[PDB]
Each structure stands twice: as C-alpha cells, then as structure tokens.
C-alpha cells in the first residue's frame, strides 16, 4: 500500500527560567499532522475526521489524561532537578515516540529524547539507553529513570501495546486520504542567468500526493547529470512542491524537455519540452 506507514507524537518543552515552561505537542503520520495539542486545556485537536481512528472516546480521553499528567509533571520535575543535572536556563527538551509498520508485517516501536539540538536518550526494549551526545547527564538521567520501573511500564504499554493497534486502526480509518492519488501540476520557467550567454532551465512540479516523485531534465532519453534538484517543500491541503534546475547555454536549451514520473500519472509521464 502507498502513503504513510508510521505514527508518532512529538513534544517540544521550552524552559525559559525556573518558573516559566511551555510545551508544544502534535501527532503525525510521517509528514502529515493528524493531531494538535492545546497546552491551555491539556486536550487534543483532531485535525482530520478519522484522527481518532477506530479508538473509543474513553481510550482517547484515557490517553489525553496520560499526556496531560506527563506534560505538567515532567516540566515541573525538570525544574526541581535542574540544579542537580547542572542545567543552564534557557534550554529545549525534544521528544519523539511512536511505531512504524515495515515490509513483512512487523510493527517496530521507538522513543527518542533530545537536549538542545543533539540526541539525549532512546528507549530500547522498555529501557533507558543514553546517547554519547548526552554525556554524563544522560548517563545520570537513565541511571535515575531505571529506578522508576512503573514509568517504564507506562512507556512499554503505550509503545508496544497501544501504538501498534492505533497505527493499524488510523491507517484504515483514513485510507481515503492517505492512499489517495493526486496528479501533479507541472510548468516551466526561466530563472537568474548563470553567467553571460547562459540560461537557467527551471522545471516546477506542484500539488502532488503521495510524496515519492521523479523529476529530470532530458534530451530525448538522455538523463542530464547537471539537473540540480531542490527540496520536497510542503504545501497546505497535504500536497508537495519540487523544483528541478539545469545550467545550460542559449543554444543547448533547444531539444531539451522535463520528464515527471509520479504514481498518480498511471504510466504516462509528464514531458514538458522547452520553448523560447
């Protein structure tokens, strides 16, 4: 099947001082956001109609409560332990926890913690594993959390029991949008001149779903190795934009075309020949 294969929740706890702390949460399906988190009410924002996906309102309320209690508890406990862990305000704590469905059937769960912009910890088989970037502080953190077995049991239960059946449920509940095929809108343009007597061949591709695409500058069947591909930049309404450039002379421009290969095109590719 096409589309996303992994569900995960992200956390961004910003600590300004020993009294101020702001947490930012959201649920994602690869690159597509399906949940929001209101830090004021301590509840979830279901962005899509199928965001609850086969889960009861009781279980959703149960899960929302666990996050609510954790978000406040963690922020408050970090402030109390900041002195011992030699923390310097301000700092940012990041977290990513979820599960992914791989080829063959296996659903593998994950949890990763971060301090600053670098890695801090990871949960491997319901145990705290400190990363080398975290140093002695991460070693001190994992040595402390291993003592609280119950917290690791909540982590284990949510990652290896709740997440796999939630992921499967939400992939079926939203297949109409996740497995959906959107035909890309492609057009050619001329960018800034890369030297006197030279042109910038720009090939724009926008509004395509799923994310896997193939764009190249062609002279018949020949693939031009000078094709400078951009980043898959996101759009609203769950679509993507990609720009492929090529530096060539004025005479070289004639006979060139832009080939676009996408899953929604059903074999017949978009070939845009250059016109002066």
């Amino acid at each position, epitope marked *: 099947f096409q589309g996303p294969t992994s569900f995960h929740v992200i956390q961004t706890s910003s600590f300004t001082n020993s009294t101020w702390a702001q947490t930012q949460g959201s649920g994602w399906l690869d690159d597509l956001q399906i949940h929001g988190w209101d830090s004021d009410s*301590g509840t979830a924002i279901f962005l899509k109609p199928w965001s609850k996906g086969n889960f009861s309102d009781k279980e959703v309320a149960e899960l929302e*409560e*666990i996050f*609510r*209690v954790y978000i*406040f*508890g963690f922020a*408050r*406990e970090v402030q109390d332990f900041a002195g011992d862990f030699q923390m310097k305000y301000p700092f940012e704590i990041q977290g990513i926890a979820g599960c992914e469905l791989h080829s063959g059937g296996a659903i593998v769960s994950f949890l990763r913690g971060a301090l600053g912009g670098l890695d801090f910890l990871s949960v491997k088989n319901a145990s705290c594993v400190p990363s080398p970037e975290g140093g002695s502080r991460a070693q001190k953190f994992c040595a402390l959390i291993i003592q*609280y*077995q*119950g*917290i690791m*049991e*909540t982590v284990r*239960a*949510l990652l290896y*029991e*709740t997440c796999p059946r939630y992921l499967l449920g939400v992939l079926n509940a939203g297949k109409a949008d996740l497995q959906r095929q959107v035909k890309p809108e492609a057009w050619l343009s001329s960018g800034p001149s890369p030297g006197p007597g030279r042109l910038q061949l720009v090939c724009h591709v926008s509004g395509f779903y799923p994310k896997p695409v193939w764009v190249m500058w062609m002279r018949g069947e020949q693939e031009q190795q000078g094709t400078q591909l951009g980043d898959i930049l996101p759009n609203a309404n769950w679509t993507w934009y990609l720009r492929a450039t090529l530096d060539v002379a004025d005479g070289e421009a004639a006979g060139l075309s832009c080939r676009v290969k996408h899953s929604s095109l059903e074999g017949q590719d978009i070939i845009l020949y250059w016109r002066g």
Partner: T-cell receptor, first 113, second 110 residues
C-alpha cells in the same frame, strides 16, 4: 496517619447536603476519594491529579468534588440518598515514586428517611 | 489491570504459614499491590510488585507472575494481629488510577 478526614461519622436525612474534607500535609500531588461497600470493595468516586484539575472515577453520581489547595480534596453530597450509605475513604500519593496510597481514617455515613 | 479475583474468606492457626492467592486480568499492567485492612480501620500499604517475582519485608512475602497472571501473599510465622482483610490491587497505565479487589478476610485462630 498523615492524612486527615473530617468528619469521622455522619447521619443525614434523605435530601440533606454534606461535605467531606480530606487534608494531607505530605505535599502529595495526586488525591483520591473512595467508597467501601460489602465486597464489592473499594470503588473510586473522583480523583485529582493537581491543585486545579479533578476527574471522575467508577461511581461519580451524584458526588461533587473540589480542589483549591494541593493539601485539601473536598467531596460533596448535595442531595443525600440511602444508596450513598457507605464508608468513605480518601487517599493521597506523590507524582513521583508513589507506588503507595496513603489512606485517611474513613467516614461512616448513614442516610435515613 | 481491572479484573481481580481472590478468596472471600481464609482461616488459619496462629504460628502457621498462610498463602493468599490472587489471579488478575489486565488490559495494561502497571504494578500489583497488596493492602492490609483491619475492621474497621483504613487500608495499609503492604507490598508493591512491578516485575516477577518474590519481594520480602518482615514476616510477609509477595510474589508476582505477569506471564501466568497471578500473585500470592505469604504470611510467615503468623500472629494474632494479622487477622484482617487483605486487598489485592492492580494499577492501570500509567500511575494515577489503581483498581482494588474484593479482599480476603483472614481469620486467625488463637
């Protein structure tokens, strides 16, 4: 005993109102209100995870709860019924490393017609 | 953990050994607890088991088996003060809510 319960015993008329006070001086974040009936056993009425918030347990009808201070969790009956004739126990545990619920002495309530 | 089964009553001779068995069914385990409750006082914390199996403290022992979904509470060299109700509890994921069993009334013969 580090958890206080007021009153110890109470007799009410069907329709009367009363308020049970649970006081704790351990600086515990989580507080609970239970009711014990012949096995059956302990049934959670309401619980508070913080000073502001409060949440429903197994049997939250028709009980009212309030948390204004981290040390006090108040249970309230607004219109007593003979069904609410039970032994009420309140308990508290910390947010971190607890693992142990500290129970109050208990309140024996009897609602008569 | 929500479904908890344990015996209603148990009678034992003073100075002997008693074993209160408890069988449970979880939809998410977070710990197994044992509580002592005298008539008609409040429940007292006795033991906490998060992993298999045995835990010791004084004359009391508590074993847990998450794989076989059961737990037992051992009462070594029994005394008269041990005559009370023994509650078997299972905590839900994660932390706050704890589900209590019906209890086991232990009668100690002098």
């Amino acid at each position: 005993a580090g958890v206080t319960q007021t009153p110890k015993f109470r007799v009410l008329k069907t329709g009367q109102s009363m308020t049970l006070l649970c006081a704790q001086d351990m600086n515990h974040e989580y507080m609970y209100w239970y009711r014990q009936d012949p096995g059956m056993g302990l049934r959670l009425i309401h619980y508070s995870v913080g000073e502001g918030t409060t949440a429903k347990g197994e049997v939250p009808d028709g009980y009212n709860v309030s948390r204004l201070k981290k040390q006090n969790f108040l249970l309230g009956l607004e219109s007593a019924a003979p069904s609410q004739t039970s032994v009420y126990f309140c308990a508290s545990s910390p947010r971190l490393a607890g693992d142990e619920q500290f129970f109050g002495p208990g309140t024996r309530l009897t609602v008569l017609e | 953990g929500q479904n908890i089964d344990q015996p209603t009553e148990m009678t034992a001779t003073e100075g002997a050994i008693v074993q209160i068995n408890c069988t449970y069914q979880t939809s998410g385990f977070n710990g197994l607890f044992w509580y002592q409750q005298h008539a008609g006082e409040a429940p007292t914390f006795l033991s906490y088991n998060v992993l298999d199996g045995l835990e010791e403290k004084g004359r009391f022992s508590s074993f847990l088996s998450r794989s076989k979904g059961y737990s037992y509470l051992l009462l070594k060299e029994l005394q008269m003060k041990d005559s009370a109700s023994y509650l078997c509890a299972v905590r839900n994921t994660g932390g706050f809510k704890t589900i209590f069993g019906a209890g086991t009334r232990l009668f100690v013969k002098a």
